[PDB]
């Protein structure tokens, strides 16, 4: 069922995952459509910042070997120190906003391993499987 932009924002993370694309589209949006003038360089600046805003994180997903995004798995195990809750305590009983409230503390820390571990090791390995 089509809910609308951010229509699942007020639901559990499990439920919300159903309709990530409805949001995804408008993360970059597009369209929009005497010189200078007020707004003359503001629509300019804003529309630019939108593009940068998008790609800055998209590239990270490019690095984190997935690309086929919205959702993908890794080979990095979850450290229990990063909010030790059960799946039903998390996915079936918590919104994404509530999630960030806690996990945001380890953002860069987790990014470390995502930015690396697998990306490093998945490769070489393959290069070696190509030996024969």
């Amino acid at each position: 069922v089509f809910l609308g932009f951010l229509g699942a924002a007020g639901s559990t993370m499990g439920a919300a995952s159903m309709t990530l694309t409805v949001q995804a589209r408008n993360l970059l949006s597009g369209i929009v459509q005497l010189k200078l003038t007020v707004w003359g360089i503001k629509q300019l600046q804003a529309r630019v910042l939108a593009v940068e805003r998008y790609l800055r994180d998209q590239q990270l997903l490019g690095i984190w070997g997935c690309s086929g995004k919205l959702i993908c798995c890794t080979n990095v195990p979850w450290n229990s120190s990063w909010s030790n809750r059960n799946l039903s305590e998390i996915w079936d009983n918590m919104t994404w906003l509530q999630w960030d409230k806690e996990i945001s503390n380890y953002t860069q820390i987790i990014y470390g391993l995502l930015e690396e571990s697998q990306n490093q090791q998945e490769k070489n390995e393959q290069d070696l499987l190509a030996l024969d």
Binding site: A9, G10, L60, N75, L87, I90, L97, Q118
Partner: protein, 438 residues
């Protein structure tokens, strides 16, 4: 065991400021602006709650400075009135004897430089005594000439407030609470979101708020700090209070070619119903609404206190009286006729005397000034009073309140409190039972 799983398109956001841009339909300053959608979208968000804070909402700051920028840009390509700064030879104007009008204008004459830079021309024009001042018939001076230069507003451009919509760029969301209750800040049980804001007219006024939005339920009292009388109070009405203001002067525009090339619009002659401009207010309506306001006040000060209303502390006319624009003309009205009452412990119509100025200073800004051209013919208009800008004045019962203003960011804030801007963060991660194979 659980693993790190990567998610994208996550419905989360952080409070953040970015560069907003306008939209409005397809006069004032708006043309270079993206047309609005024929179907503005929205969506109520269920289970979503969070805090608002109108007192730190930087949307106001941007809007304020943007409007200022627009103002200047609309004047640069217009005619400068630099050579008007000359000694004026002025005399009283014999209005219908004896003297009810008090003159208020002088039949000034002066040697003016014309298109023929060389031979000058003795001309005349009617000026308000609020615009000119005696030097040292008698000699007079345009008041602006002691502070800065003055520019004539183009006769083609208008000042009619036009509904403007604000939009955020992709990655940013416009959040809008629909909660009819709001203290000025805190959590809202009922939050929605929109593509863009509703049309807001850039109405400049002091003391009284005009042509704004209406409140639901009861009268709304909002203040950064009610107990702190160094702050002020925003009052939003529930029902439009009609005010009808008139300038009964079918006057002409003896335009004078003080070139070269560029033309000046002087004041011709004043004929017709020589009465002072004034405003008409429905008295019973005012009394009724004021009472509703006092009810609120009772609710934040006690069920055994006394409420008195009075005029300002005086001083700068711009703050002392109610200033507003109608059709290009600038009015200054004595709101003592409104703000003069009291309430205990637990037609009819009102006439408000007004004055007309032609030299004005916007947004408390010094260093420049703008000359309003006289508008030909009788000028009369009507608007909706939709709120008050009040200030809080042996402190155990009787309290006195009075009208203020000055800082016009207050006006924008009186509307934008319904909105806030947040930055979406699409990228998130979470623990999920999944080990990824090659």
């Amino acid at each position: 065991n659980l693993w790190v799983t990567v998610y994208y398109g996550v419905p989360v956001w952080k409070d953040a400021e970015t560069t907003l841009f306008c939209a409005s339909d397809a006069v004032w300053a708006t043309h270079a602006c993206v047309p609005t959608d024929p179907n503005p979208q929205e969506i109520h968000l269920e289970n979503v709650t969070e805090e608002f804070n109108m007192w730190k909402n930087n949307m106001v700051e941007q809007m304020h400075t943007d409007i200022i920028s627009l103002w200047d840009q609309s004047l640069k390509p217009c005619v400068k009135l630099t050579p008007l700064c000359v000694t004026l030879q002025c005399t009283n104007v014999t209005n219908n004897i004896t003297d009810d009008m008090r003159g208020e204008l002088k039949n000034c004459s002066f040697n003016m430089t014309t298109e023929l830079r060389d031979k000058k021309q003795k001309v005349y024009s009617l000026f308000y005594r609020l615009d000119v001042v005696q030097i040292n018939n008698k000699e007079y001076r345009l008041i602006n000439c002691n502070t800065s230069a003055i520019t004539q507003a183009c006769p083609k451009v208008s000042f009619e407030p036009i509904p403007i919509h604000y939009c955020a760029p992709a990655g940013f969301a416009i959040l809008k609470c629909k909660d009819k209750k709001f203290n000025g800040t805190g959590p809202c049980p009922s939050v929605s979101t929109v593509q863009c804001t509703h049309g807001i007219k850039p109405v400049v006024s002091t003391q009284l708020l005009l042509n704004g939005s209406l409140a639901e339920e009861e009268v709304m009292i909002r203040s950064e700090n009610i107990t702190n009388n160094a702050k002020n109070i925003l009052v939003q009405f529930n029902t439009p209070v009609q005010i009808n203001c008139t300038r009964p002067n079918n006057n002409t525009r003896k335009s004078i070619r003080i070139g070269p090339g560029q033309a000046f619009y002087a004041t011709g002659d004043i004929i017709g119903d020589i009465r002072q401009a004034h405003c008409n207010v429905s008295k019973a309506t005012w009394n009724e609404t004021l009472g509703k306001v006092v009810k609120q006040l009772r609710k934040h000060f006690g069920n055994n206190t006394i409420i008195r209303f009075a005029n300002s502390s005086g001083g700068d006319l711009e703050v002392t009286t109610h200033s507003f624009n109608c059709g290009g003309e600038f009015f200054y009205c004595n709101t003592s006729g409104l703000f003069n009452s009291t309430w205990i412990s637990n037609n009819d119509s009102i006439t408000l005397p007004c004055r007309i100025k032609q030299i004005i200073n916007m947004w408390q800004r010094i260093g420049q000034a703008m000359y309003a051209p006289p508008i030909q013919g009788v000028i009369r208009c009507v608007s909706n009073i939709t709120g008050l800008i009040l200030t809080r004045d042996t402190n155990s019962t009787t309290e006195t309140f009075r009208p203020g203003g000055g800082d016009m960011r207050d006006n924008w804030r009186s509307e934008l409190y319904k909105y806030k801007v947040v930055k979406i963060e699409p990228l998130g991660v979470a623990p999920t039972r999944c080990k990824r194979r090659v």
